[PDB]
């Protein structure tokens, strides 16, 4: 019964058009709940889950100002980093920022994070102690010096251990009906012959939340891994997830195989068989 809040920011420069595109999203666990998009008409932080709509306009007002200021800072940092890397004002670049907190089953702080990237690679990150920073390269070192001399880590830590955790707890309460659920996967198996002496068995899990899941093929009780083809867990579009796993078997050997299915919403692992 661990939970986490995470915010994701992406700023992309748009050389030859105008200001950067800036996109913010917020999650509690695997569930999205707010968004800000610099292009959109509204210019507001916007609800994305039924249970955050009960917040009064003053929440939206504060979220919208804070997110806006983040946006401006990211816009200026794109300029500086372009310099640091001797890049050019004709090229498009990306800053990404990921932060938030974990709480344990009881609501109390376990872990806090914040990390930044440039053009899809690590740039700088807050360490586990929340008091110090790792810089991925020479440019990020310049940043790290500024942040050390500003005592930025101290303000990160105070948010991550304070407000991050408080608002997470609140949201877990206001949204307990969706957020604290465990929808077990609906499962089934399919069978396509593909030669004379060969068929695909595909094992399916649909409708589950949270997204964390394991699917495993066995042959006479022993885990395969060599011929399992398996897709990334993908979202369904209604807050649930899907996933599958396939294995190519000799035709006639179908009952030797079993698919094992692990999920937090399942009292015990499931075993599927083509039967």
């Amino acid at each position: 019964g661990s939970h986490s809040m995470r915010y994701f920011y992406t700023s992309v420069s748009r050389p030859g058009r105008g200001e950067p595109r800036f996109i913010a999203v917020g999650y509690v666990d695997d569930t999205q709940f707010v968004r800000f998009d610099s292009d959109a008409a509204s210019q507001r932080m916007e609800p994305r889950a039924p249970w955050i709509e009960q917040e009064g306009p003053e929440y939206w007002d504060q979220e919208t100002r804070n997110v806006k200021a983040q946006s401006q800072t990211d816009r200026v940092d794109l300029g500086t980093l372009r310099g640091y890397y001797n890049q050019s004002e004709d090229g498009s670049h990306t800053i990404q920022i990921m932060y938030g907190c974990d709480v344990g089953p009881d609501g109390r702080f376990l872990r806090g994070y914040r990390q930044d990237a440039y053009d899809g690679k690590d740039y700088i990150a807050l360490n586990e102690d929340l008091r110090s920073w790792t810089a991925a390269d020479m440019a990020a070192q310049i940043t790290k010096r500024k942040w050390e001399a500003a005592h930025a880590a101290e303000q990160q830590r105070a948010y991550l251990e304070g407000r991050c955790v408080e608002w997470l707890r609140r949201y877990l309460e206001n949204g307990k009906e969706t957020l604290q659920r465990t929808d077990p996967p609906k499962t089934h198996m399919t069978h396509h012959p593909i030669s004379d002496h060969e068929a695909t068995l595909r094992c399916w899990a649909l409708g589950f939340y949270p997204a964390e899941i394991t699917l495993t093929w066995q042959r006479d009780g022993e885990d395969q891994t060599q011929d399992t083809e398996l897709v990334e867990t993908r979202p369904a579009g209604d807050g649930t997830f899907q996933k599958w796993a396939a294995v190519v078997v000799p035709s006639g050997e179908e009952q030797r195989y079993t698919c094992h299915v692990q999920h937090e919403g399942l009292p015990k692992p499931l075993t599927l068989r083509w039967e």
């Binding site: 915010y7 913010a24 929440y59 504060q62 804070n66 001399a149 948010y159 407000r163 991050c164």
Partner: peptide, 6 residues
Amino acid sequence: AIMYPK
């Protein structure tokens, strides 16, 4: 809820 030295 989300989160110039002289």
